[model samples]
Target: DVSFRLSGATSSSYGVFISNLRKALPYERKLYDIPLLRSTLPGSQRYALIHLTNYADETISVAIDVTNVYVMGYRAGDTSYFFNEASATEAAKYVFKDAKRKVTLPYSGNYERLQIAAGKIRENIPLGLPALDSAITTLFYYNANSAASALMVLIQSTSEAARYKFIEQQIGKRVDKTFLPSLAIISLENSWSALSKQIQIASTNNGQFETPVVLINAQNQRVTITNVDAGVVTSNIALLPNRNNMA
Candidate 1:
């Protein structure tokens, strides 16, 4: 299977897209380190690493773009393929006005590995109830920077009215304004099934939105429904460490 891994840290304050072309090429092979630019800020560090591998004969090209900044792949003959999520039509247009000018194909093959590293520095935002608006906006802003990344919004509601308001006001507004191409909403079974069907039916006619809100029985773990498309699943959420506690 073709796979890639990215790791890096950005400033605690601002949200910026750290360039990764220089760090993505493999070292042992004919690698090319293309430095995009250096930051002007002092005492700030940002870094990222992206690794990709191909395991097929079809040639594939990878491209990375962030808000007018882009790097294309070098084309390799048909044997492997490598391309970033930025290459997708929906995503590429957002990054560059002319896709052909911004894309590069270094090589083509089914089995290819690509890696990327970058650094970013930005002002940090405070985290608390008082900063909830900024915090949520920042979270969504970062998620919009990449198509490969996924964002799931969870709202726990004790009353039906509150739940409907949360969906109609917050969730719907964000999705509409952001023009998010991909997202998933998950809720309890009865609520999910009823709402999901309505969404699916509407999508079929208008084709404006395609994401599905899944329904789950919080009480039953093993009862798997066969029809719904599963996006991401985990056994536990609390086991995950709190970001504030991280070193």
Candidate 2:
């Protein structure tokens, strides 16, 4: 019944966040106007509008004058809800851009819309790729970060190996190295079942001599999974025989 609004900056480069909290949101909203947007929700509002200010130095793309205003909304709540416009001015007029992504096909066939829909829920906000990595560095909540990380693995990359590597790098990249395990634990599906990669990408990228990979827990003691105690735990790599690690 009540709509809250927040204005932001947009020019040649800078932008702002929605909540004092921010994130790497999904790609479903607007594919072109990625100049930048701050939203906790979605819709075609993202498609219809244009710039945020009449005084900006940038030229309008589909507008006849300085009246274009980009929109942001959602299908999650009320019949209609939109945060106000304008002081969000200085909004960058966007240009054409295509979706560059990889997706695994359903074995027989599944509703493309339904399947894609299944992946972008409350916690699975997509970030497109590494360019948005820095903006996603801080998530307001840990579970959102965890869920986003898992969803990111499924949608961002197309292979089991890539998924494993992605979770590893994304956790390392998004938050403190000390928090990686906690983050991973929140996202981990029963015994790391979500990460049971069937293959290793050539053993390593062979790019750097990283570290002794110590896990920081409540105890602050060094922990490593280099060995799973043989029978105590298993990576479950054997269950994915039908998995196609193809991109």
Candidate 3:
């Protein structure tokens, strides 16, 4: 039972969102590390954002670069990845379950080269757990909110069955019978109440949530639902097998 929280110093609105992501990230220890984001952006969990801000007081009102926002999940199975496009592409080499899908972002944005301009790579804070390159289950959440050009990522295979189980429970509710599971993008509009509640949900693994939610359909438009009733489907999603074949 890893306990990841969203406690940190004063941060931008986007920062708060990133902090919440840490709660869902299912990792240990929170580090204040992020790439140099664009002026209209701030570093989000692991996701970088590209924004269009013509004003100096870049508030949350800053327009978001929709095409660039990305949220990805990677099961670190003794894999080494230095955060970047090349890595996102290279990381795609190993995928889980059937489909063998690449562990890449679902977005179709073009990749850009990354180069260090000027700045010291923050001191690596020791994370007691061997730290052989963050060997833990992790999430990559880059968005249109960061000005960061690039970053590093790492993960170690905790276990396929367990991973599938986690995904099943976390992302498991079928919108309909055959329809794919719907993702509940719980929102927190620059508020602490949202943060605290989000923590309770992440730590407890309880998505018994009831609140107004933003639903994004096939079209990019986002609409607010009256309420997303409190519930977690009683049915459990099946797991993959590792039994030996008669061969």
Off by over 4 Å in 3: 1-79, 84-211, 217-228, 232-247
**lDDT of model 1, residue 157:** 9
lDDT of 3 by residue, 1-247 (tens): 1122112211232223333322223222221111112223222332322211111221111111111222123322232222334534532343222223343433222222211211211122111111111212122223312212212111101111111222222221211111212222111111113322332343344433344334433243455433223121111111111111000
Off by over 4 Å in 1: 1-90, 94-165, 170-185, 188-247
Per-prediction TM-score to the true structure, in the order listed: 0.19, 0.17, 0.19
Go through the candidates in order and give the clash count of each.
45, 4, 18
Q: In candidate 2, what are the lDDT values of residues 90-147, reduced to their tens digit?
A: 1212211221211121211111322253444313333222212221221111133242
Q: Give candidates' CA RMSD values in order.
A: 20.8, 19.5, 20.9
Report the error of model 2 at residue 61, Å.
32
lDDT values for all models: 0.23, 0.23, 0.23
156-238: candidate 1 lDDT, tens digit per residue: 10011112222222222332122211112223312432333333343354522233434444332334433323322221110
